[PDB]
Amino acid sequence: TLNGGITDMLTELANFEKNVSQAIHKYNAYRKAASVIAKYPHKIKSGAEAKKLPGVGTKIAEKIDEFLATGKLRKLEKIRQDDTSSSINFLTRVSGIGPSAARKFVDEGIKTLEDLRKNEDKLNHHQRIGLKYFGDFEKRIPREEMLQMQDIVLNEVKKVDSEYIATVCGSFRRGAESSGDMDVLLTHPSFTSESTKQPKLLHQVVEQLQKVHFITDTLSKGETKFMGVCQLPSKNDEKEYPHRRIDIRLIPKDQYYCGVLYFTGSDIFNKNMRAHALEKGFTINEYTIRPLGVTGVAGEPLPVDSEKDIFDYIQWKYREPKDRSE
DNA sequence: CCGACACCGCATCAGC
DNA sequence: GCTGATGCGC
DNA sequence: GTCGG
Ligand SMILES: O=c1ccn([C@H]2C[C@H](O)[C@@H](COP(=O)(O)NP(=O)(O)OP(=O)(O)O)O2)c(=O)[nH]1
Ligand SMILES: [Cl-]
Ligand SMILES: [Cl-]
Ligand SMILES: [Cl-]
Ligand SMILES: [Cl-]
Ligand SMILES: [Mg+2]
Ligand SMILES: [Mg+2]
Ligand code: NA
Ligand code: NA
């Protein structure tokens, strides 16, 4: 974190634009700048120097000059003192409470943890769980704990059916020493892009994990995507581990590489790679990579047999997972 | 100047 | 119920 | 807020 000060500033700005301004593009603009600056191998000495990086424009260059000279940014100093912005930024920290619901709760006089807790009845299911585990969800997950969780998940999966293949992706697959959550990509020979020869494929797994008390709560659940809560078991007299967020994504086995590519991220890396794909005349999603015919309409899926093939299609040299943390 | 900005599953609600 | 818009987290 | 045509 050579430029931690600047990147934090940019991230706060991005959060403000998303949560308060509800200006998604400025949000992504600030996040891109923060990312490009985060990988810059030099301690930035001026805005001009920063403005040379792609994604850093004139406005951010000036803010960087202000921050470098004063150690702060007036724009953020004001934002922080604004009660409405503070309330909204706080509420959005609760899983399930987005920019809209946050501003809505503020209008109704619900702007603090105390308020949320006493108005549980005004929350949807997801928001309730998010509130319940507010503290825990803010904690990082040590890779050590991620290894224990991977062990439980893969083994429980094998017990349901030896043909399931569960791969932990997200930041974990990228080599991170700590993760915000656990993301599991699941595949089974019965479910391909050609047919679903077996229903409840995801349900079976969720069920087994709850049965052994690994999964404790459910934020949302469908045929191919599960979003919930899990907790490592603790030993006798040992204090309980914090509850953790867990995402499970069931993907057609023949589309594993596009799925593993997507679920490995980062989200910014995917945004960059997907944008570059478009510029190269292709469209990439978690299922396939297809060409972009003149009409702008996507064509038929191109053959893929490894993550590298996807990279080849867009003329990008392969990048190992640990090098996709943008 | 200015249109484009990655792409999608599940939850919830309004209209028919 | 079916469908489409919108929110929220991927 | 930034960038490409
Ligand atoms: O907007 C998004 C979010 C996530 N993703 C993909 C990439 C990301 O790595 C993966 C899992 O999402 P998480 O929110 O779990 N992020 P990640 O695992 O990278 O980091 P973290 O340690 O915070 O969970 O889903 C996107 O493509 N777009
Ligand atoms: Cl500041
Ligand atoms: Cl694939
Ligand atoms: Cl597709
Ligand atoms: Cl996902
Ligand atoms: Mg993750
Ligand atoms: Mg996740
Ligand atoms: Na730039
Ligand atoms: Na939130």
PDB file of N, CA and C in Angstrom, chain A residues 145-239:
ATOM      1  N   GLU A 145      -8.657 -20.112   8.358  1.00  0.00           N
ATOM      2  CA  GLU A 145     -10.053 -20.504   8.553  1.00  0.00           C
ATOM      3  C   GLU A 145     -10.696 -20.882   7.222  1.00  0.00           C
ATOM      4  N   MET A 146     -10.265 -20.237   6.142  1.00  0.00           N
ATOM      5  CA  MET A 146     -10.807 -20.550   4.824  1.00  0.00           C
ATOM      6  C   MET A 146     -10.462 -21.996   4.474  1.00  0.00           C
ATOM      7  N   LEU A 147      -9.277 -22.441   4.883  1.00  0.00           N
ATOM      8  CA  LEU A 147      -8.849 -23.803   4.597  1.00  0.00           C
ATOM      9  C   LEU A 147      -9.712 -24.809   5.344  1.00  0.00           C
ATOM     10  N   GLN A 148     -10.061 -24.496   6.587  1.00  0.00           N
ATOM     11  CA  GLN A 148     -10.906 -25.389   7.380  1.00  0.00           C
ATOM     12  C   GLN A 148     -12.303 -25.469   6.752  1.00  0.00           C
ATOM     13  N   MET A 149     -12.805 -24.326   6.294  1.00  0.00           N
ATOM     14  CA  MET A 149     -14.129 -24.251   5.680  1.00  0.00           C
ATOM     15  C   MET A 149     -14.175 -25.004   4.351  1.00  0.00           C
ATOM     16  N   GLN A 150     -13.102 -24.887   3.574  1.00  0.00           N
ATOM     17  CA  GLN A 150     -13.002 -25.565   2.285  1.00  0.00           C
ATOM     18  C   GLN A 150     -13.096 -27.060   2.539  1.00  0.00           C
ATOM     19  N   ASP A 151     -12.405 -27.495   3.585  1.00  0.00           N
ATOM     20  CA  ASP A 151     -12.355 -28.902   3.951  1.00  0.00           C
ATOM     21  C   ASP A 151     -13.740 -29.445   4.272  1.00  0.00           C
ATOM     22  N   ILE A 152     -14.496 -28.684   5.053  1.00  0.00           N
ATOM     23  CA  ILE A 152     -15.845 -29.091   5.408  1.00  0.00           C
ATOM     24  C   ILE A 152     -16.722 -29.139   4.159  1.00  0.00           C
ATOM     25  N   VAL A 153     -16.719 -28.060   3.386  1.00  0.00           N
ATOM     26  CA  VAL A 153     -17.546 -27.994   2.191  1.00  0.00           C
ATOM     27  C   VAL A 153     -17.255 -29.088   1.161  1.00  0.00           C
ATOM     28  N   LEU A 154     -15.986 -29.295   0.831  1.00  0.00           N
ATOM     29  CA  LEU A 154     -15.651 -30.318  -0.157  1.00  0.00           C
ATOM     30  C   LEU A 154     -16.026 -31.715   0.334  1.00  0.00           C
ATOM     31  N   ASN A 155     -15.759 -32.002   1.601  1.00  0.00           N
ATOM     32  CA  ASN A 155     -16.099 -33.310   2.131  1.00  0.00           C
ATOM     33  C   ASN A 155     -17.592 -33.546   2.255  1.00  0.00           C
ATOM     34  N   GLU A 156     -18.334 -32.520   2.663  1.00  0.00           N
ATOM     35  CA  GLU A 156     -19.770 -32.693   2.796  1.00  0.00           C
ATOM     36  C   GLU A 156     -20.368 -32.890   1.407  1.00  0.00           C
ATOM     37  N   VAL A 157     -19.814 -32.176   0.431  1.00  0.00           N
ATOM     38  CA  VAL A 157     -20.275 -32.277  -0.948  1.00  0.00           C
ATOM     39  C   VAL A 157     -20.043 -33.698  -1.456  1.00  0.00           C
ATOM     40  N   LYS A 158     -18.843 -34.221  -1.227  1.00  0.00           N
ATOM     41  CA  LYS A 158     -18.520 -35.567  -1.676  1.00  0.00           C
ATOM     42  C   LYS A 158     -19.511 -36.573  -1.101  1.00  0.00           C
ATOM     43  N   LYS A 159     -19.907 -36.369   0.152  1.00  0.00           N
ATOM     44  CA  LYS A 159     -20.837 -37.276   0.809  1.00  0.00           C
ATOM     45  C   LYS A 159     -22.200 -37.308   0.140  1.00  0.00           C
ATOM     46  N   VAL A 160     -22.631 -36.179  -0.415  1.00  0.00           N
ATOM     47  CA  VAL A 160     -23.924 -36.129  -1.080  1.00  0.00           C
ATOM     48  C   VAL A 160     -23.838 -36.889  -2.398  1.00  0.00           C
ATOM     49  N   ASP A 161     -22.759 -36.652  -3.133  1.00  0.00           N
ATOM     50  CA  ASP A 161     -22.539 -37.316  -4.409  1.00  0.00           C
ATOM     51  C   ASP A 161     -21.084 -37.125  -4.812  1.00  0.00           C
ATOM     52  N   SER A 162     -20.383 -38.234  -5.007  1.00  0.00           N
ATOM     53  CA  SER A 162     -18.979 -38.216  -5.392  1.00  0.00           C
ATOM     54  C   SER A 162     -18.737 -37.498  -6.717  1.00  0.00           C
ATOM     55  N   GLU A 163     -19.784 -37.304  -7.511  1.00  0.00           N
ATOM     56  CA  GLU A 163     -19.606 -36.650  -8.804  1.00  0.00           C
ATOM     57  C   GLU A 163     -19.656 -35.122  -8.783  1.00  0.00           C
ATOM     58  N   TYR A 164     -19.978 -34.553  -7.629  1.00  0.00           N
ATOM     59  CA  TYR A 164     -20.001 -33.100  -7.497  1.00  0.00           C
ATOM     60  C   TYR A 164     -18.546 -32.635  -7.478  1.00  0.00           C
ATOM     61  N   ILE A 165     -18.298 -31.441  -7.990  1.00  0.00           N
ATOM     62  CA  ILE A 165     -16.962 -30.861  -7.934  1.00  0.00           C
ATOM     63  C   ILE A 165     -17.179 -29.463  -7.371  1.00  0.00           C
ATOM     64  N   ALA A 166     -16.628 -29.211  -6.187  1.00  0.00           N
ATOM     65  CA  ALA A 166     -16.762 -27.918  -5.534  1.00  0.00           C
ATOM     66  C   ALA A 166     -15.403 -27.254  -5.544  1.00  0.00           C
ATOM     67  N   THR A 167     -15.352 -26.042  -6.083  1.00  0.00           N
ATOM     68  CA  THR A 167     -14.112 -25.293  -6.178  1.00  0.00           C
ATOM     69  C   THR A 167     -14.266 -23.962  -5.453  1.00  0.00           C
ATOM     70  N   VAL A 168     -13.366 -23.653  -4.522  1.00  0.00           N
ATOM     71  CA  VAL A 168     -13.465 -22.370  -3.835  1.00  0.00           C
ATOM     72  C   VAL A 168     -12.800 -21.322  -4.711  1.00  0.00           C
ATOM     73  N   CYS A 169     -13.551 -20.281  -5.053  1.00  0.00           N
ATOM     74  CA  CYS A 169     -13.020 -19.221  -5.894  1.00  0.00           C
ATOM     75  C   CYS A 169     -12.883 -17.889  -5.158  1.00  0.00           C
ATOM     76  N   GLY A 170     -13.290 -16.800  -5.803  1.00  0.00           N
ATOM     77  CA  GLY A 170     -13.176 -15.497  -5.174  1.00  0.00           C
ATOM     78  C   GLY A 170     -11.755 -15.151  -4.765  1.00  0.00           C
ATOM     79  N   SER A 171     -11.630 -14.307  -3.750  1.00  0.00           N
ATOM     80  CA  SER A 171     -10.323 -13.889  -3.272  1.00  0.00           C
ATOM     81  C   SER A 171      -9.474 -15.078  -2.825  1.00  0.00           C
ATOM     82  N   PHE A 172     -10.114 -16.117  -2.294  1.00  0.00           N
ATOM     83  CA  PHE A 172      -9.379 -17.299  -1.842  1.00  0.00           C
ATOM     84  C   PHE A 172      -8.557 -17.902  -2.978  1.00  0.00           C
ATOM     85  N   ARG A 173      -9.196 -18.128  -4.123  1.00  0.00           N
ATOM     86  CA  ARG A 173      -8.496 -18.707  -5.267  1.00  0.00           C
ATOM     87  C   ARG A 173      -7.393 -17.778  -5.778  1.00  0.00           C
ATOM     88  N   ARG A 174      -7.534 -16.482  -5.512  1.00  0.00           N
ATOM     89  CA  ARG A 174      -6.538 -15.520  -5.945  1.00  0.00           C
ATOM     90  C   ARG A 174      -5.345 -15.458  -4.996  1.00  0.00           C
ATOM     91  N   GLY A 175      -5.348 -16.311  -3.972  1.00  0.00           N
ATOM     92  CA  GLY A 175      -4.245 -16.344  -3.021  1.00  0.00           C
ATOM     93  C   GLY A 175      -4.308 -15.410  -1.817  1.00  0.00           C
ATOM     94  N   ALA A 176      -5.391 -14.659  -1.675  1.00  0.00           N
ATOM     95  CA  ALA A 176      -5.537 -13.721  -0.557  1.00  0.00           C
ATOM     96  C   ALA A 176      -5.298 -14.354   0.821  1.00  0.00           C
ATOM     97  N   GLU A 177      -4.624 -13.620   1.706  1.00  0.00           N
ATOM     98  CA  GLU A 177      -4.352 -14.113   3.054  1.00  0.00           C
ATOM     99  C   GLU A 177      -5.580 -13.973   3.946  1.00  0.00           C
ATOM    100  N   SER A 178      -6.564 -13.226   3.462  1.00  0.00           N
ATOM    101  CA  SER A 178      -7.816 -13.037   4.190  1.00  0.00           C
ATOM    102  C   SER A 178      -8.896 -12.755   3.156  1.00  0.00           C
ATOM    103  N   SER A 179     -10.118 -13.191   3.447  1.00  0.00           N
ATOM    104  CA  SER A 179     -11.245 -13.016   2.531  1.00  0.00           C
ATOM    105  C   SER A 179     -12.466 -12.397   3.203  1.00  0.00           C
ATOM    106  N   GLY A 180     -13.300 -11.735   2.406  1.00  0.00           N
ATOM    107  CA  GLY A 180     -14.510 -11.130   2.932  1.00  0.00           C
ATOM    108  C   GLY A 180     -15.591 -12.185   3.111  1.00  0.00           C
ATOM    109  N   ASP A 181     -15.475 -13.274   2.350  1.00  0.00           N
ATOM    110  CA  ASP A 181     -16.425 -14.380   2.414  1.00  0.00           C
ATOM    111  C   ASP A 181     -15.861 -15.598   1.688  1.00  0.00           C
ATOM    112  N   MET A 182     -16.660 -16.659   1.625  1.00  0.00           N
ATOM    113  CA  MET A 182     -16.278 -17.877   0.911  1.00  0.00           C
ATOM    114  C   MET A 182     -17.203 -18.027  -0.291  1.00  0.00           C
ATOM    115  N   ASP A 183     -16.624 -18.197  -1.473  1.00  0.00           N
ATOM    116  CA  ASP A 183     -17.415 -18.372  -2.680  1.00  0.00           C
ATOM    117  C   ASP A 183     -17.101 -19.752  -3.249  1.00  0.00           C
ATOM    118  N   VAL A 184     -18.147 -20.550  -3.436  1.00  0.00           N
ATOM    119  CA  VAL A 184     -18.002 -21.901  -3.943  1.00  0.00           C
ATOM    120  C   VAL A 184     -18.686 -22.112  -5.284  1.00  0.00           C
ATOM    121  N   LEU A 185     -17.919 -22.615  -6.246  1.00  0.00           N
ATOM    122  CA  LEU A 185     -18.459 -22.910  -7.564  1.00  0.00           C
ATOM    123  C   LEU A 185     -18.743 -24.402  -7.526  1.00  0.00           C
ATOM    124  N   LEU A 186     -19.949 -24.784  -7.910  1.00  0.00           N
ATOM    125  CA  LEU A 186     -20.321 -26.186  -7.883  1.00  0.00           C
ATOM    126  C   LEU A 186     -20.698 -26.680  -9.274  1.00  0.00           C
ATOM    127  N   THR A 187     -20.331 -27.921  -9.587  1.00  0.00           N
ATOM    128  CA  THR A 187     -20.701 -28.531 -10.865  1.00  0.00           C
ATOM    129  C   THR A 187     -21.073 -29.983 -10.608  1.00  0.00           C
ATOM    130  N   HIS A 188     -21.874 -30.543 -11.505  1.00  0.00           N
ATOM    131  CA  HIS A 188     -22.298 -31.932 -11.408  1.00  0.00           C
ATOM    132  C   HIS A 188     -22.610 -32.375 -12.833  1.00  0.00           C
ATOM    133  N   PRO A 189     -22.186 -33.590 -13.211  1.00  0.00           N
ATOM    134  CA  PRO A 189     -22.428 -34.111 -14.561  1.00  0.00           C
ATOM    135  C   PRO A 189     -23.883 -34.095 -15.021  1.00  0.00           C
ATOM    136  N   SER A 190     -24.822 -34.139 -14.079  1.00  0.00           N
ATOM    137  CA  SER A 190     -26.245 -34.122 -14.424  1.00  0.00           C
ATOM    138  C   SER A 190     -26.733 -32.787 -14.980  1.00  0.00           C
ATOM    139  N   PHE A 191     -26.045 -31.710 -14.619  1.00  0.00           N
ATOM    140  CA  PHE A 191     -26.428 -30.376 -15.053  1.00  0.00           C
ATOM    141  C   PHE A 191     -25.420 -29.780 -16.030  1.00  0.00           C
ATOM    142  N   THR A 192     -25.791 -29.748 -17.309  1.00  0.00           N
ATOM    143  CA  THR A 192     -24.942 -29.181 -18.356  1.00  0.00           C
ATOM    144  C   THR A 192     -25.777 -28.140 -19.098  1.00  0.00           C
ATOM    145  N   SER A 193     -25.155 -27.438 -20.039  1.00  0.00           N
ATOM    146  CA  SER A 193     -25.868 -26.425 -20.808  1.00  0.00           C
ATOM    147  C   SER A 193     -26.878 -27.120 -21.716  1.00  0.00           C
ATOM    148  N   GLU A 194     -26.779 -28.442 -21.785  1.00  0.00           N
ATOM    149  CA  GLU A 194     -27.659 -29.235 -22.621  1.00  0.00           C
ATOM    150  C   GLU A 194     -28.893 -29.757 -21.906  1.00  0.00           C
ATOM    151  N   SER A 195     -28.777 -30.011 -20.608  1.00  0.00           N
ATOM    152  CA  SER A 195     -29.921 -30.513 -19.860  1.00  0.00           C
ATOM    153  C   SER A 195     -29.686 -30.634 -18.365  1.00  0.00           C
ATOM    154  N   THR A 196     -30.787 -30.635 -17.624  1.00  0.00           N
ATOM    155  CA  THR A 196     -30.755 -30.797 -16.184  1.00  0.00           C
ATOM    156  C   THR A 196     -31.425 -32.145 -15.966  1.00  0.00           C
ATOM    157  N   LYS A 197     -30.605 -33.189 -15.893  1.00  0.00           N
ATOM    158  CA  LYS A 197     -31.089 -34.551 -15.705  1.00  0.00           C
ATOM    159  C   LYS A 197     -31.431 -34.841 -14.249  1.00  0.00           C
ATOM    160  N   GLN A 198     -31.111 -33.893 -13.373  1.00  0.00           N
ATOM    161  CA  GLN A 198     -31.382 -34.031 -11.945  1.00  0.00           C
ATOM    162  C   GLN A 198     -31.743 -32.696 -11.315  1.00  0.00           C
ATOM    163  N   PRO A 199     -32.902 -32.626 -10.647  1.00  0.00           N
ATOM    164  CA  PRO A 199     -33.321 -31.381 -10.001  1.00  0.00           C
ATOM    165  C   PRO A 199     -32.738 -31.337  -8.584  1.00  0.00           C
ATOM    166  N   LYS A 200     -32.982 -30.245  -7.862  1.00  0.00           N
ATOM    167  CA  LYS A 200     -32.487 -30.096  -6.489  1.00  0.00           C
ATOM    168  C   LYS A 200     -30.968 -30.230  -6.336  1.00  0.00           C
ATOM    169  N   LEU A 201     -30.229 -30.153  -7.435  1.00  0.00           N
ATOM    170  CA  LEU A 201     -28.783 -30.287  -7.341  1.00  0.00           C
ATOM    171  C   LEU A 201     -28.171 -29.356  -6.299  1.00  0.00           C
ATOM    172  N   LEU A 202     -28.588 -28.092  -6.288  1.00  0.00           N
ATOM    173  CA  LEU A 202     -28.061 -27.139  -5.316  1.00  0.00           C
ATOM    174  C   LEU A 202     -28.699 -27.369  -3.947  1.00  0.00           C
ATOM    175  N   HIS A 203     -29.999 -27.647  -3.939  1.00  0.00           N
ATOM    176  CA  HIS A 203     -30.716 -27.888  -2.695  1.00  0.00           C
ATOM    177  C   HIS A 203     -30.054 -29.003  -1.886  1.00  0.00           C
ATOM    178  N   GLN A 204     -29.771 -30.124  -2.545  1.00  0.00           N
ATOM    179  CA  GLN A 204     -29.136 -31.267  -1.894  1.00  0.00           C
ATOM    180  C   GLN A 204     -27.912 -30.845  -1.095  1.00  0.00           C
ATOM    181  N   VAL A 205     -27.059 -30.049  -1.726  1.00  0.00           N
ATOM    182  CA  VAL A 205     -25.848 -29.575  -1.089  1.00  0.00           C
ATOM    183  C   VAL A 205     -26.154 -28.637   0.073  1.00  0.00           C
ATOM    184  N   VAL A 206     -27.002 -27.643  -0.162  1.00  0.00           N
ATOM    185  CA  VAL A 206     -27.361 -26.706   0.900  1.00  0.00           C
ATOM    186  C   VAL A 206     -27.857 -27.483   2.119  1.00  0.00           C
ATOM    187  N   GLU A 207     -28.761 -28.423   1.864  1.00  0.00           N
ATOM    188  CA  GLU A 207     -29.360 -29.268   2.894  1.00  0.00           C
ATOM    189  C   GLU A 207     -28.331 -30.009   3.740  1.00  0.00           C
ATOM    190  N   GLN A 208     -27.396 -30.678   3.074  1.00  0.00           N
ATOM    191  CA  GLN A 208     -26.342 -31.419   3.760  1.00  0.00           C
ATOM    192  C   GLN A 208     -25.505 -30.485   4.638  1.00  0.00           C
ATOM    193  N   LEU A 209     -25.210 -29.290   4.130  1.00  0.00           N
ATOM    194  CA  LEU A 209     -24.405 -28.335   4.887  1.00  0.00           C
ATOM    195  C   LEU A 209     -25.132 -27.767   6.091  1.00  0.00           C
ATOM    196  N   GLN A 210     -26.453 -27.682   6.010  1.00  0.00           N
ATOM    197  CA  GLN A 210     -27.223 -27.186   7.143  1.00  0.00           C
ATOM    198  C   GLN A 210     -27.329 -28.334   8.141  1.00  0.00           C
ATOM    199  N   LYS A 211     -27.532 -29.540   7.623  1.00  0.00           N
ATOM    200  CA  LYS A 211     -27.660 -30.715   8.472  1.00  0.00           C
ATOM    201  C   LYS A 211     -26.482 -30.901   9.431  1.00  0.00           C
ATOM    202  N   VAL A 212     -25.267 -30.603   8.970  1.00  0.00           N
ATOM    203  CA  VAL A 212     -24.088 -30.742   9.824  1.00  0.00           C
ATOM    204  C   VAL A 212     -23.798 -29.416  10.516  1.00  0.00           C
ATOM    205  N   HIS A 213     -24.787 -28.529  10.479  1.00  0.00           N
ATOM    206  CA  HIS A 213     -24.697 -27.218  11.109  1.00  0.00           C
ATOM    207  C   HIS A 213     -23.588 -26.313  10.603  1.00  0.00           C
ATOM    208  N   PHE A 214     -23.238 -26.426   9.325  1.00  0.00           N
ATOM    209  CA  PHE A 214     -22.219 -25.536   8.790  1.00  0.00           C
ATOM    210  C   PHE A 214     -22.934 -24.290   8.276  1.00  0.00           C
ATOM    211  N   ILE A 215     -24.008 -24.477   7.512  1.00  0.00           N
ATOM    212  CA  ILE A 215     -24.790 -23.345   7.013  1.00  0.00           C
ATOM    213  C   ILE A 215     -25.824 -23.085   8.094  1.00  0.00           C
ATOM    214  N   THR A 216     -25.897 -21.842   8.559  1.00  0.00           N
ATOM    215  CA  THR A 216     -26.806 -21.449   9.642  1.00  0.00           C
ATOM    216  C   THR A 216     -27.998 -20.594   9.227  1.00  0.00           C
ATOM    217  N   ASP A 217     -27.832 -19.798   8.176  1.00  0.00           N
ATOM    218  CA  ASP A 217     -28.904 -18.924   7.712  1.00  0.00           C
ATOM    219  C   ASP A 217     -28.880 -18.817   6.198  1.00  0.00           C
ATOM    220  N   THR A 218     -29.999 -18.381   5.630  1.00  0.00           N
ATOM    221  CA  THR A 218     -30.131 -18.236   4.185  1.00  0.00           C
ATOM    222  C   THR A 218     -30.579 -16.828   3.792  1.00  0.00           C
ATOM    223  N   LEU A 219     -29.769 -16.136   2.997  1.00  0.00           N
ATOM    224  CA  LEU A 219     -30.125 -14.792   2.553  1.00  0.00           C
ATOM    225  C   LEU A 219     -31.034 -14.865   1.330  1.00  0.00           C
ATOM    226  N   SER A 220     -30.721 -15.780   0.419  1.00  0.00           N
ATOM    227  CA  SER A 220     -31.516 -15.991  -0.792  1.00  0.00           C
ATOM    228  C   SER A 220     -31.123 -17.344  -1.364  1.00  0.00           C
ATOM    229  N   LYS A 221     -32.041 -17.971  -2.082  1.00  0.00           N
ATOM    230  CA  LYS A 221     -31.768 -19.284  -2.621  1.00  0.00           C
ATOM    231  C   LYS A 221     -32.618 -19.618  -3.840  1.00  0.00           C
ATOM    232  N   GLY A 222     -31.954 -20.074  -4.896  1.00  0.00           N
ATOM    233  CA  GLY A 222     -32.636 -20.455  -6.117  1.00  0.00           C
ATOM    234  C   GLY A 222     -32.026 -21.741  -6.650  1.00  0.00           C
ATOM    235  N   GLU A 223     -32.356 -22.081  -7.890  1.00  0.00           N
ATOM    236  CA  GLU A 223     -31.853 -23.292  -8.532  1.00  0.00           C
ATOM    237  C   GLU A 223     -30.348 -23.308  -8.777  1.00  0.00           C
ATOM    238  N   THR A 224     -29.753 -22.142  -9.000  1.00  0.00           N
ATOM    239  CA  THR A 224     -28.322 -22.095  -9.278  1.00  0.00           C
ATOM    240  C   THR A 224     -27.459 -21.202  -8.391  1.00  0.00           C
ATOM    241  N   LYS A 225     -28.081 -20.372  -7.554  1.00  0.00           N
ATOM    242  CA  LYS A 225     -27.311 -19.491  -6.683  1.00  0.00           C
ATOM    243  C   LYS A 225     -27.835 -19.427  -5.253  1.00  0.00           C
ATOM    244  N   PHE A 226     -26.942 -19.704  -4.306  1.00  0.00           N
ATOM    245  CA  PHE A 226     -27.262 -19.669  -2.883  1.00  0.00           C
ATOM    246  C   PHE A 226     -26.424 -18.589  -2.200  1.00  0.00           C
ATOM    247  N   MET A 227     -27.067 -17.796  -1.352  1.00  0.00           N
ATOM    248  CA  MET A 227     -26.369 -16.759  -0.610  1.00  0.00           C
ATOM    249  C   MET A 227     -26.777 -16.947   0.838  1.00  0.00           C
ATOM    250  N   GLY A 228     -25.823 -17.329   1.678  1.00  0.00           N
ATOM    251  CA  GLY A 228     -26.167 -17.561   3.065  1.00  0.00           C
ATOM    252  C   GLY A 228     -25.096 -17.298   4.095  1.00  0.00           C
ATOM    253  N   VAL A 229     -25.243 -17.958   5.235  1.00  0.00           N
ATOM    254  CA  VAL A 229     -24.331 -17.791   6.351  1.00  0.00           C
ATOM    255  C   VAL A 229     -23.840 -19.148   6.834  1.00  0.00           C
ATOM    256  N   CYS A 230     -22.577 -19.199   7.242  1.00  0.00           N
ATOM    257  CA  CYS A 230     -21.989 -20.436   7.741  1.00  0.00           C
ATOM    258  C   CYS A 230     -21.055 -20.115   8.900  1.00  0.00           C
ATOM    259  N   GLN A 231     -20.698 -21.147   9.662  1.00  0.00           N
ATOM    260  CA  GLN A 231     -19.835 -20.996  10.825  1.00  0.00           C
ATOM    261  C   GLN A 231     -19.036 -22.263  11.089  1.00  0.00           C
ATOM    262  N   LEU A 232     -17.741 -22.107  11.301  1.00  0.00           N
ATOM    263  CA  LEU A 232     -16.887 -23.244  11.608  1.00  0.00           C
ATOM    264  C   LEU A 232     -17.264 -23.739  12.999  1.00  0.00           C
ATOM    265  N   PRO A 233     -17.182 -25.057  13.228  1.00  0.00           N
ATOM    266  CA  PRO A 233     -17.525 -25.572  14.553  1.00  0.00           C
ATOM    267  C   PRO A 233     -16.353 -25.272  15.481  1.00  0.00           C
ATOM    268  N   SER A 234     -16.642 -25.006  16.746  1.00  0.00           N
ATOM    269  CA  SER A 234     -15.584 -24.706  17.697  1.00  0.00           C
ATOM    270  C   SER A 234     -15.412 -25.876  18.647  1.00  0.00           C
ATOM    271  N   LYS A 235     -14.259 -25.939  19.301  1.00  0.00           N
ATOM    272  CA  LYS A 235     -13.973 -27.011  20.244  1.00  0.00           C
ATOM    273  C   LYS A 235     -14.556 -26.683  21.617  1.00  0.00           C
ATOM    274  N   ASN A 236     -14.454 -27.632  22.541  1.00  0.00           N
ATOM    275  CA  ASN A 236     -14.973 -27.433  23.886  1.00  0.00           C
ATOM    276  C   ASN A 236     -14.313 -26.249  24.578  1.00  0.00           C
ATOM    277  N   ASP A 237     -15.124 -25.476  25.300  1.00  0.00           N
ATOM    278  CA  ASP A 237     -14.660 -24.300  26.038  1.00  0.00           C
ATOM    279  C   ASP A 237     -14.149 -23.174  25.143  1.00  0.00           C
ATOM    280  N   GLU A 238     -13.970 -23.474  23.862  1.00  0.00           N
ATOM    281  CA  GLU A 238     -13.500 -22.487  22.896  1.00  0.00           C
ATOM    282  C   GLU A 238     -14.605 -21.500  22.551  1.00  0.00           C
ATOM    283  N   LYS A 239     -14.239 -20.236  22.358  1.00  0.00           N
ATOM    284  CA  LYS A 239     -15.212 -19.221  21.989  1.00  0.00           C
ATOM    285  C   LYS A 239     -15.616 -19.480  20.534  1.00  0.00           C
TER     286      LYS A 239
END
